[PDB]
Structures are given as C-alpha cells and as structure tokens.
C-alpha cells in the first residue's frame, strides 16, 4: 500500500450466505486509502485478522467515501496506531491538527515514515478520534490552543532562485 493523499471509506462486508447461516452479520470498517480498489483490499486484510472471513467467501456490500462533516473547522485528531519495527511491534498515540480527518491520517503516514522509517504496510490505523483541546496530551499540538496566537515569519528564505538567476542585488530576508 502506497499513499499520496488519503480518503476515508465506509466499507461494509458480509460472509456469503451458506445453508447454515442464512443472514450473516454485516460488518463495517473505516479505512483510509488512496482509492477504492485499495480500500476494498484493506478491508479483507483487517477482517481476515478479526473474523474467520476471506474475500472468496464474502462480498463488499457497500464501499463509499466518507466526506468530512466540517471541513472548515480546525480540529484536533487523536490517532491510535500499531506498527512493526525492525524489532517487534509497538503501540502509539499521536496527535495532529487538520481540517479533514483523512488529512490528519495522511499527515501521520508521512510522519511515521519520517520519525520511525515506518513504511505504510507496517502501520495499522486502529482508531482515529477528534479530541477536545482540553484532553490533548501532545505539547506540539497544544501550543496552538491560544486565542491570542501571534508570531512573525522570521527568516524568509528566497524561493525564486532562478528568476533571475544572475542578478546585481543581494536578496533581502527581513519582511
């Protein structure tokens, strides 16, 4: 499983009706994935680990995209995950700030690869929750919880370094 920007999916599946259980229970997961072809196969990855269910004796009943129910409010996102290292596997709780839920999960996949060199197949997102500002634990998130937030943009580095490429004046960085 690669990435690129994730979407949330509501995937619902159920075992095929045998002549033993005529109506098997519907199960749903919420699954972050680049698209719905990958989303339906993360479903059978996780649901094989929980119930004795393979995709041969099963069917994706529904697979639809969940849209963000307030994509303009800034939220705090608690994420519980579980990942394999070079050594054994470990549990984590991370926190982020984002406008969308899948934006926060995408931000976590980049960050688990950055800090831990965790590739995306090693990570299992197991619960993602919106947290109030009072219940947050991570001080990298909580410093933005301030109604009078104020900071400058200190040392602006020049980005257009080739337009022009040869020039006569040296760049300013104080703005």
């Amino acid at each position: 499983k690669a990435s690129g920007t994730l979407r949330e999916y509501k995937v619902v599946g159920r075992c095929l009706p045998t002549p033993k259980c005529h109506t098997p229970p519907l199960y749903r997961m919420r699954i972050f994935a680049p698209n719905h072809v990958v989303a339906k196969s993360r479903f059978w990855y996780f649901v094989s680990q929980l119930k004795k269910m393979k995709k041969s004796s099963g069917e994706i009943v529904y697979c639809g995209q969940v849209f963000e129910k307030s994509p303009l409010r800034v939220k705090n996102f608690g994420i519980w995950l579980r990942y394999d290292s070079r050594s054994g596997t470990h549990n984590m709780y991370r926190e982020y700030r984002d406008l969308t839920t899948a934006g926060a999960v995408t931000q976590c996949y980049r960050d688990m690869g950055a800090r831990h060199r965790a590739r995306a197949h090693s990570i299992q997102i197991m619960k993602v929750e919106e947290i109030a500002a009072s219940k947050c634990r991570r001080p990298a998130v909580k410093q933005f919880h301030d109604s009078k937030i104020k900071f400058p943009l200190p040392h602006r580095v020049l980005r257009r370094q080739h337009k022009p490429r040869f020039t006569t004046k040296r760049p300013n960085t104080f703005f």
Binding site: L158, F166, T167, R170
Partner: protein, 201 residues
C-alpha cells in the same frame, strides 16, 4: 550577448557557484569570477581543512612532480572545482575552461564594472543560519597561500577608492532629483505618459 559575465565571489558556496559557472561556460558565455577569498564552504572550518589536507597527501609517490598539482590560491582552488564539473579531457571542455577567468581580489580590468550575484548559490539562501561554514581565503592561508595579507591591503585600498565613487555618484542622484522639482511645469506632459504605461509609480 557578447559581453562577459562578472560574478562576485563573496558569500557564495563553492560547489553551488561552480555548477552554475560550469554550465554557462559550456554554453558560450565568457565569465569572470572575482574575489575568491570570500567564497564560503559549509561545514565547520576544521572539517573542511582536513579535506584539503587529505587532498595534499595524494601524490604520485614514484615521482610527485608528476602528481596531483595541489593549487593553493583561492582562485585556483575554485578553478579546479569547476574543472571537475567540465569534460576537460575533450576539446570542448578545454575550450570551455579558457572562457573562465578567476581572480583573487578584483584586478583593474574589473574593479570598475558592476558585479553579478547568483542567489541560488548564496550562503544566506542555501544554509540554515545555525550551521557552521568556512572561508576559502582563510583555509587557503593555512594550507600555504602566501598572499592573503597583500591581497587584504589591496582590497581595503580598492574599497576606499570605491567609497569616494559612491558618494559622488550619490551626489549626482540628488542633483537629478533636485532638477525634477525645478522642471516640473515643462515635463508634466511627459511624466503623464510614462505614468500611464507603468513607468514612474
């Protein structure tokens, strides 16, 4: 475009400036790099000195007069980095490498010409400010360059002749601004045409 390209060396990182120069020289473009003592190298000083002293040990031990020629002026250290970015075993790269003139200080053909700056090779653009760097002029002094004292005494002499030029050039700039207030009832017609089409904010 037949003129030469005069680049000030000061404040530029060594290998970022060198890839800029080496691509221009292969595209025609005579280029002169002046003031090569001001060229910076990132990483702290002692680290970069060791990389030059490690270079000073590579010599052909059978006959070191044939060996790697360890040039020690800052202009000729810069000249070998841009040579390493050139295909200098071919006629095309040898004809490149003599479109490049390198100088320590600023000699009297080029002291009265305005220098260019490459912003994609500057220390203030390309390094975080909490990173250590070195100077090519200092590092060449500890490896055997004889002449940083005489080059410093000739750069401080050039600058005090250049301060006198600036405050006379700036003295004409306020006479021109004085003139624009004397004549404004007879150029108000022409300063409306220029202000309409994007000149003269």
């Amino acid at each position: 475009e037949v003129q030469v390209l005069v680049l000030d060396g000061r404040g530029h990182l060594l290998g970022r400036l060198a890839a800029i120069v080496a691509k221009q020289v292969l595209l025609g473009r005579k280029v002169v790099v002046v003031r090569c003592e001001g060229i910076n190298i990132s990483g702290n000083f002692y680290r970069n000195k060791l990389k030059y002293l490690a270079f000073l040990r590579k010599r052909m031990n059978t006959n070191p007069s044939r060996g790697p020629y360890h040039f020690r002026a800052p202009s000729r250290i810069f000249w070998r980095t841009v040579r390493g970015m050139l295909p200098h075993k071919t006629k095309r790269g040898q004809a490149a490498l003599d479109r490049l003139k390198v100088f320590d200080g600023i000699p009297p053909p080029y002291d009265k010409k305005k220098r260019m700056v490459v912003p994609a090779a500057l220390k203030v653009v390309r390094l975080k400010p909490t990173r250590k760097f070195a100077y090519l002029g200092r590092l060449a002094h500890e490896v055997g360059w004889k002449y940083q004292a005489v080059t410093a005494t000739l750069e401080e002499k050039r600058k005090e002749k250049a301060k006198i030029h600036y405050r006379k050039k700036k003295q004409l700039m306020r006479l021109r601004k004085q003139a624009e207030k004397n004549v404004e009832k007879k150029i108000d017609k022409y300063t409306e045409v220029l202000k309409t089409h994007g000149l003269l904010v």
